[PDB]
Nucleic acid binder design. Structure first.
Lengths: 122, 124, 116, 125
RNA sequence: UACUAAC
RNA sequence: AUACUAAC
RNA sequence: AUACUAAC
RNA sequence: UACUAAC
């Protein structure tokens, strides 16, 4: 439990992009999968990490600070696993700012799947 | 000065959500007439999808209510070489729309900016 | 019967092998296009012949797909199938063109040189 | 005045065909000297891939031969904000590289042109 | 990137 | 338009 | 018929 | 991604 790192989301450059939803996916399924991929605990934190709002009740201890910019806090019990977390977190942000019209297949899946989980599906 | 024409079809079925007509026209039609300058062609956006619901037909030029074809650029010039340069510069418009993330479109980013200025609304 | 030319954005994309992507191994991709659309489609113009038919040996135009069919419905279909490829060619990241990928793999497999 | 650091990792895995080091450095290192003045940090390119094959070690600054991490920009400032700007300034170059199709990379264009000037081998042609 | 309308 | 960059 | 995602 | 060549 000795290693960690902060991957900073380029929000100042892409103020338009919903990075947080993308990384999370429906019910957080996309983030938990990133964690299995990298074998890291990943937590999205800092400025704008919280949408407003559900009660501060039952919320993560120390998720509520917004003076450090938006980042994924990645944690692993090994150094090379950290590099994997950054890697997998990078891939999501790369999907965001390199994907041409209608070709973010991940966001498509997430929204389709989100609807599936809501009974609001097509 | 005998004229001819050709059609550049827009990939509408592929990109249903995309507003190609406004991309090619730009604020006050400026983007279009810019292409007409670059190419030495007259360009008309024609076909199904080229006129609004519910436009007054007497505000439209001859041939604009021809809907035998889907949305296209009609390229008019007195030479083959001119015509293919018209298709080209329209192609460059459509291709940039199709290969853009959702924020890297400097044309559209620019067009909308210009529109704000004319309507006096440049926020930031 | 009806006839149309679909020009390839070669000038915009100077180092993209469009024709090879259009044709596929043995000409199989283009033949899929011709049946997906019901059109007769030929690659013509400067670049249609490697470094035909009547009249396939004429190149006083730039590179295009000449699309021919009995209906305008069909002509429109032939346009978008050629369009699909060009946009895939252009919107697919390198290494990530599925179509191109499967074409060189089928070609190796056809020439009997498939790697594991 | 105490100084601290942070690292910005380059997507070399995802983009193995791309010379990020060359892109960040520019001619005579001038591109990277510009990032330092904007951000008000000192920025060094370090990690595996930062040092060319056969490089004479006697020509490298302290720490340059530390290879336990992949390629990254190392940013050293005396405040969090300055480092934040360091990261942001290096991040912008990498986005440019990655989000530019063929011959659309304008900074790279400029650098190659600036390098041509500098070495009397230009062709504005 | 304020959602564009020419001939 | 791509001259492929090498700082500390 | 990209349904705009909220994990710990 | 073995780099395709049909009519």
């Amino acid at each position: 439990t000795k290693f960690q790192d902060k991957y900073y989301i380029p929000v100042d450059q892409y103020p338009d992009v919903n990075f947080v939803g993308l990384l999370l996916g429906p019910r957080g399924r996309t983030l938990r999968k990133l964690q299995e991929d990298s074998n890291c605990k990943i937590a999205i934190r800092g400025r704008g990490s919280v949408k407003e709002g559900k009660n501060a009740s039952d919320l993560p201890p120390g998720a509520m600070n917004f003076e450090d910019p938006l980042h994924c806090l990645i944690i692993a019990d090994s150094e090379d696993k950290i590099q994997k977390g950054i890697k997998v977190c990078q891939n999501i942000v790369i999907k965001a700012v390199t994907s041409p019209e209608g070709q973010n297949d991940l966001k498509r899946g997430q929204l389709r799947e989100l609807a599936e989980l809501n009974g609001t599906l097509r």
